[model samples]
Target: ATTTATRLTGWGRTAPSVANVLRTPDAEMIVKAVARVAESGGGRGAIARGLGRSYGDNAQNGGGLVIDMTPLNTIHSIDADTKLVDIDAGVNLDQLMKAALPFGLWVPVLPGTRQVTVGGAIACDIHGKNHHSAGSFGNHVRSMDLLTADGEIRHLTPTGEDAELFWATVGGNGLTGIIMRATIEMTPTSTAYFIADGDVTASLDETIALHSDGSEARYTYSSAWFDAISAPPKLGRAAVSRGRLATVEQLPAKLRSEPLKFDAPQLLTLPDVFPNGLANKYTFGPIGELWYRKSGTYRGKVQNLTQFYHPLDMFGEWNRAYGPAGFLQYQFVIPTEAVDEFKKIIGVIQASGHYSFLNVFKLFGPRNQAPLSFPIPGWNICVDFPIKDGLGKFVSELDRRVLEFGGRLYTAKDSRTTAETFHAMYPRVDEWISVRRKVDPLRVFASDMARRLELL
Candidate 1:
């Protein structure tokens, strides 16, 4: 293992802090790293970091030990017949998909990007476009190996004796322990392509209805891109895209030769010299207009996995588009019953005069067992805003309104929300804390997010 002092930030590139980063390929080394921190009377404690895809401080430990787990990536085994995969927690979904796609298998739940690691996915319990039907990443996890604060490794199962601890580690924000690896139940797909349908919505109400008016049962994947900068009647004008896994017969002639080939490639990487304010209404307004117009009503178009799920991955370091000051995504979920509240929240953002680069809308199904999981049966609205003057206060106001609507922010993308607000948002915080305390009473597992959100 090698240790070096470095400044680290989340994917949003905000709230950076210096830490003693321990880079090691071995899982035993992680155990020792945690042990060393515990032996020092839990000084600042230690936290595990995966691909650093978390848009907040959850992966960071200021002035503490940060275990870099990327080197621990390994695909241990794949049971094609059973649609099961045993993979290292540090392995990103990109690696897992390339291996599983050949066997006509895919991760049951995939977020917008393939950059997420298996461990990060579980800790965040991420949901995808198919969340309305497939649930979250944690729901597909059969078992996992967690390296606890006591320097002991435990195999946890959802229905086993350690079920409570297992649930805590899932969506626990990496505060409970270091997830070493996991066994995931994969979904079978005949090809790596998706048959998609697209519709240009006229208004907010129609856009919201496009998702629930029998489309969820028809499509395995669904999401909408909203034009946040536009006003009132056109404010929520959106492009709704719904997809189902394409069968071999559905493949066009050219793609038939390599139906399951994973070919997502990085075409360009944004340089750091990019300027800020590029994401404002002036620039994004026209892009939004062009996007909405181009994505006119259509159906049965075959889209590759990359085109359908991870269009952003085509450009490396796309977050840099927000510039050096970085950006944050104000992602929250309000109950489906509060559909008007959801519309009102968007209206508020429009009235703020601040522009968001992307405004995504999705429908989530039933809640899972993880108390810290973000998704519920609701309308999930995720909008990205660059760091700018008055943005913090503006977002805080939105937070208040969200809570009043019985909504909660997604901790995975949160960097600015207050501890009190987070506590009020998730009512099951106490239940999750009780389980975490049992495994780490000394608070040996800690992170910047844990402190900010007062999870400890």
Candidate 2:
């Protein structure tokens, strides 16, 4: 719908690149742009971009066409009882939540942030605290409309012969094709509150064990925050949390009156300008103390859906707190059996003296059908490290260690991983590329990430 040449960066604000950006209005416009690029020699083809939350290079294209997909927002129907919804892929999850919650329904899976578009969610196959229960985003997808390189608008679903293509496209980083719309599987909820409990774990093993223990079997959600900054006798000590959807009977009388009312808070206004870097040991020191003490030794608490799911969302532009240099989010999943390696990896991170602003540890139930999907019924951890000196070498070593333990990094958060490391992590990656080739034989869909990881 519109075209402009601009320098763009991901949410992390890392190494930005220049591109000819085409913000397309709909599938028709996307097809036209595809044709334009094809006619002009298909330079880097085009990569579909959304809300810029990818935090890495996945949505970026160097000297190429970066297609903005947000304009594709359109809603068809949402069945509260049947728990099914049809929406354009570009619709942001925040918009979907505003629409679904009033009807006593919610998306089955959500990542840490809701600013993500449905299409981007599918592209990343994002997971949440309930990944141990509900699986990643791809598992909830019923079908989608795809625009392949050949310009054919094909309907794709996990049925029979099309299943292969469907799975490939889900976590293919949009290389398989551009998603126009999708049918989502929704979950019925009695209320919008989470009956939650939080406690501290002494060590990484204790933390992982607590998540795996049958005591939390009935709980539908779980996530933990490790004290990555304070590395000492309490290193890897974490505030572990577990919760489930609060039933109407469990809510307080005041909240019960409007249990299903969607009362999302307005984002507080913040200054448009930010410092070069606002996060470091100096800033995070006091902040970490407060967080570490917040997790009590007891349980039994109630919080709204918004409060329970997105605590970090309260601070708009929280990423900017890290400053202009940006940050790198190293998220990986090692098999549950690799506890020793997990501990060693934590030790490495702790000894490096880089105070990670956030460390999210969770347990995953099973891998989705996508060959490139990151989860695989194991222990997962995501740590945010501000970009700084010696970070690359530190991360590269961690990458090698993760590969040794048969682990993989989340592609959505990867910005520096090499193609060799990526291949070592994803054993079935070739299968995904094969299916992607069939749909985009001309390699019309491309991105910095695709080329960097040699995914093309």
Candidate 3:
């Protein structure tokens, strides 16, 4: 096993840094590489890298080695009857879904995009539209094989004596260990189609109420697209959508033959931006409004799961549309009672006139036990902003305001968050770090995000 120097950033393409990139074919290679990296100092340290779907620096380790885990892709076992799958952590959700759907099974927690590896998904503790009903990915995990910093592959589960370590590793962001493979509990679905309905909301309050209703509990998936560039009543105008997996009998006669047939069309590509990028105020601001209005009131539409859940997966290299400068997303959650704080935060962003094209506002249900896991029982919002002058300062301002009202930023999406704010946002970070030090006394597993946030 050898590593070569390469420049890597995140999906956002911000903060380019050089690192030795190494690909691991299996657990043996990973164990050997970790032991060797510890014996030598050719790099700062080694951190596992998956699909690089993280929008920020989670996948990069400056002056270190990134262990590419994609080659370890293999499905070890599957029990269609028991809805259990044992797979290499490097296998992505897209592959899992493609295989499971035909068996009337689905990955319980599907994030916005299926491009991320299961290891990355667990590392980030991803959530999605159905989070309010099903919880994050870590909740569905049965057990996993973790290569600790000491180069020992341990079989860990969420129960028994190693429970704390397992939960810590759930959202530990590859700092605790290199996840090798795991048995995941899959969900059963009647078909790959969804019956969805939604309408554009009038005001932020109305939207908030709609999400909090909890009236239609059967709508397993729900989310809202908000107007980021609009002001006044339209400031938080949302296009609220909710849906559930459709039964095989609900599909029309033409679609009944193959109920679980995956309908993922080939990836779509758009031309790159010429100069400053497509995220500028003049470009995406108006474009965001169009999307806001374009999601006109639609009801009970039969759509494929790929179209309803993983719309972003359809586009490849779409981030290039942001141009050379790239863009970063801010995803955060505040308690349901923090309505005033939510409004205040939105007010700050709107008043600043910073261009954030994609804005979301949704309500989340019960949170999982992962110390650093992101979602909580509250209102969650995510917005995207291009890298520009004073953007860091602006987000810092958001940090102070959010922390004041007990809100936290998503580690997977943050680029400029300070160590102080990271600690303040996730108070249990110290606990996670304690577990890291227990297994990795020398801090052998690290990343740019870990170093920046002082997690070591």
RMSD of each: 3.6, 3.8, 4.0
CA lDDT of each candidate? Answer: 0.86, 0.83, 0.83
Top of the candidates by lDDT: 1
> 220-243, model 3: which lDDT tens digit per residue?
898877877777676787877789
For this target, which candidate reaches the highest TM-score against the unseen true structure? 1
Order the candidates by TM-score, highest first: 1, 2, 3
Report the alpha-carbon TM-score of model 3 versus the true structure: 0.91
Q: Which RMSD does model 1 reach against the true structure?
A: 3.6
lDDT at residue 197 of model 1 (Cα atoms): 86
What residue pairs are clashing in model 3? none
Output the better candidate (1/2) by lDDT.
1
- When summed lDDT is taken over every stretch of 10 residues in candidate 3, the lowest stretch is 268-277
* Clashes, model 1: 0
The weakest ten consecutive residues by lDDT in model 2 span: 269-278
Model 2 lDDT at residue 167? 94
Summarize candidate 1's per-residue lDDT along 382-415 as a digit string, tens digits: 8877777988899999999999999999988898
Name model 3 segments beyond 4 Å from true: 40-43, 266-295, 312-320, 323-325
